[PDB]
Write a protein that binds this DNA or RNA. Sequence first.
RNA 1: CGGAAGAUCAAGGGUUCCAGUCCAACGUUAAUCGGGGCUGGGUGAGUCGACCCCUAAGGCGAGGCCGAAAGGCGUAGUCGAUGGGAAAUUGGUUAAUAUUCCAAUACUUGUUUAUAGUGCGAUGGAGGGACGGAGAAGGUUAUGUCAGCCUGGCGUUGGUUGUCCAGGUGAAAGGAUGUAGGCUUACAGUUUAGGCAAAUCCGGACUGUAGGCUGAGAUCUGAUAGCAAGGAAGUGGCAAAUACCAUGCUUCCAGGAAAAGCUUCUAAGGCUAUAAACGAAUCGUACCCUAAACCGACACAGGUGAUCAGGUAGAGAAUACCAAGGCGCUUGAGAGAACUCUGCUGAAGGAACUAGGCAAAAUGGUACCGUAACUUCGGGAGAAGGUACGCUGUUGAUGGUGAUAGGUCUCCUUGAGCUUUCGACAGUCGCAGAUACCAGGCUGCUGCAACUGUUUAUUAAAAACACAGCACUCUGCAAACACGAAAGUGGACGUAUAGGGUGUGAUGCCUGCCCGGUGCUGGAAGGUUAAUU
Lengths: 88, 44, 272
Amino acid sequence: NNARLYQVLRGPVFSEKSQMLGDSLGVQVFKIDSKATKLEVKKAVELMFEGVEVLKVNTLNVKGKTKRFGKNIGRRNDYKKAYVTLKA
Amino acid sequence: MKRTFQPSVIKRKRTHGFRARMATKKGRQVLARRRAKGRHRLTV
Amino acid sequence: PIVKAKPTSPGRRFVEKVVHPHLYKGRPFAALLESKSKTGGRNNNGRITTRHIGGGHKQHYRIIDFKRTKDNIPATVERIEYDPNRTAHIALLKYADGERRYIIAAKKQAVGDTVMSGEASPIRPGNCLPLKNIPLGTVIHNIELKIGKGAQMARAAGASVQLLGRDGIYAILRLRSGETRRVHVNCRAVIGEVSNTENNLKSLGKAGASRWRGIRPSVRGVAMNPVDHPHGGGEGRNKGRHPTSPWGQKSKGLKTRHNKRTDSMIIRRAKK
RNA sequence: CGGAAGAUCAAGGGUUCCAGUCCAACGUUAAUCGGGGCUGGGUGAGUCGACCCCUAAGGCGAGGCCGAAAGGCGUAGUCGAUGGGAAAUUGGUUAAUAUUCCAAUACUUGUUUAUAGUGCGAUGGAGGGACGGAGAAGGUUAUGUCAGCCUGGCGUUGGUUGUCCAGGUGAAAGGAUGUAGGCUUACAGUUUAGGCAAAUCCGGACUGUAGGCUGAGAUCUGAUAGCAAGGAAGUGGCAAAUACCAUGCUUCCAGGAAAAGCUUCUAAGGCUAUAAACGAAUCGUACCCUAAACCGACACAGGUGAUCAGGUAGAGAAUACCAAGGCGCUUGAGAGAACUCUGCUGAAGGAACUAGGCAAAAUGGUACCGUAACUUCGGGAGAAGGUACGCUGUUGAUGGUGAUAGGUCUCCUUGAGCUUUCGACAGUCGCAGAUACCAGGCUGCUGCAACUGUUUAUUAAAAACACAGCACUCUGCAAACACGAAAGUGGACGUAUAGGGUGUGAUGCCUGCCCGGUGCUGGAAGGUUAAUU
């Protein structure tokens, strides 16, 4: 369905690896939904950025860091990010 | 020298885990006792 | 026969091995094979119920045709093989229809000769006959006890039974145990003595050879403490008690036979 | 340090990884530093692993069996890896990932469509998968070393334009090929007491006709890759693994997983080639891992499975010194008493020490010579004890590889260069040549136990236990015996040449008397004798 592809992409990644990949190979780095597949990432990117064609999706899960605060021991959310290669 | 603990996750979860407790009447009584005491850790 | 090892090692000084050059050097017929894992002498409770059992070589089970119901179809002895599951040799039989089976090899049974099963069969080593078609006084083995159940008695290496006579529907047999017994005359037996007659002439030589066969060491009762064995205890060497098992049962003459249903099938025993 | 204290993992941990920033606490001192605080970042796969398909031990187990209850067992099945089952390699790149990204060249397996031909189909049948110990001869490669080549250098001190010095330099998987090895008659026809039914498939029985499978490596291709001082080289000899051929071969007895994938056959009732397009999900991937990150309360001298395995010596994965790589072990500074620890040397003596040569000192390699009592003929034995050993030159013999020639992954002869292993002669230096490290002390009498083994984790390793061997006895198979309440099990898919119990304990010579006591076995004439009636 089309109401699932809107929630697949959670936000772009802004870091030096992201910027280097975008400059050199023109790949987009996204934070994606933790339950999203590579096929849904392909469809979401091509749907929401009209005029672009996805070549390859590489995905990974990254664990959240244990960051204490006051007397507590919490931890950040896990999250999944995708590297999306585009037809230039 | 070699010490007593010698950890192994498969062995731990198969001898003490949630399914091993739930698979016996006495393990379910273990779990009921832990829930009545209010333990945040039910099983290994 | 028996060959002595040269005393090159102290562990070789007393090895007397049984050597049969005529046994097949290859692998058993794979269709008549089953996987068979050791028990360690432990039952379904996981408890040791038979002591001194452990380790040894991996071995397959050979499916032996103890029943011999392929009657009136001649079989040729394709080869004679060593069997790790028993002391006797096993003859691979190839029937006229091409079906292959394993049987207990008789002592006077070689490669090429034909064995027969049924009632109209010659009195030759390897043939399987009902006991009523077997003339008195011939040496037989692989005796049935129930009709159709298969051979149970006289199956070990060198086994033989004397067919003494008949007293109705029962055949009178003298067993190697020295027991005269009656067996229903419609039960079967195989003509001849079982092969590997020099089984009990062998000498293992060393402890490791016993370990290779899956026999764990055996600790005497007087070598224990009284909490382990009735023979345990004592300052120095002492017996102190009538001999018993680790469960308090006498071991020096006490008879242990309960079967009241089979009591009438036994004629007598021998006293020496 | 360098058979790690280097590198790759697994297990375990869980962010310890990288950067910036801070130094209170933590770090056995200080700290600007950190595995500490804080804030950001970082892990990219059809091919690696998991998942997945398959099964081992062992679990659970429709029904079933047993059991006061709870439950115990078990059939079909269903789970369960530590095992079987598809497939990529070289190079570059980040501060931190890389067989994942990028480049180049590969491979595996699917779906859809289309073109032809066309009997397809299984949880079942048969094949196959598919397997032990040891040992040996080869052929190789990885790798090394020298050379060749390229780029630089002419040396703080005699000499060094040379036969000089240093550094650099060798592309894989794959595709062809089919070698050293290993195995091995092939086809056609007829028929069928078998493979639970069926079978064109296997098995069996008959009749004529006469190189193939597998396979390391080399070679060709891949291949105008990449790689430094700013635009270079890049191919020959020799040596050589414990890796590969090889799940081979040869031997032995203790006789050597399973099931699936896969190939075929049919039973009830789509498939094979050709491509073209399009796919191959999900989870792990950082980092430690002989450790400061795991197990030991600690940044603890302990423990922790597998993999890789450079040089010179060397038998060697010992040892010594080095390479790549990594470290200097998170208190230092003095002083240089006693005394303690760990070492080195020691006059004369040489066990006088002491419970006791405890400890120490000593011996130690290779080759050759030589070697006693006794013996079970194997041994003892490396008995004991001697001699030689460095370097230089000359010289004899010899194994391997094989350029160049003479008669197509070929054969035969000669054999350059390199290399191996044994001698002889002559000289020469030193106190000393197995010069360091490394590396048996030996012998005589006697007790014990045959021996290899096992044991009191943490004061006892032994003469104790075990042991092959011996005897007695039980056990006729629903065996005796053992677990269990029973069902169900082990014994054993064994069968008296077997299995259980007990004692003894290789071997040699052997093992006397006693049946009163207590057991065990047999017997029943008599006496006594329960419930019951």
